[PDB]
């Protein structure tokens, strides 16, 4: 079977400026936060263009 | 430089559902919420290939 290893993270408020520093700083082509002035959770992400895309998870 | 958001609506499903969500629609992951404790999800594929998984929570 194939196994998925899980990554746990807590999700925390802050700037789209600092998920940008924080992700870089893992180096991770993801970067899943609570935007600080929205509210609502982001995921930040490197496209396969090289440059970042913003995805905003409704909880709809 | 400018960037526009891209809106998603999640929803609950176990690691197998959202493995066939991400096939079907040809990307590289997958988000959604895991049914199995409420938590956001992202099924990714690695950069070996391999799947990975991250779960975020409060």
């Known amino acids: 079977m194939q ?3 899980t990554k ?3 999700l925390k408020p802050m700037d ?3 998920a940008r520093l ?4 893992l180096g991770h082509d993801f970067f899943i936060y ?7 959770t982001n995921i930040l992400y490197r496209r396969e263009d090289g440059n970042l ?8």
């Open 8 to 10: 746990n993270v807590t």
């Open 53 to 60: 895309g913003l995805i905003e998870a409704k909880l709809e």
């Open 22 to 25: 924080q992700m870089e700083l």
């Open 16 to 18: 789209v400026e600092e």
């Open 34 to 40: 609570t935007d600080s002035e929205d509210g609502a």
């Open 3 to 5: 196994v998925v290893r």
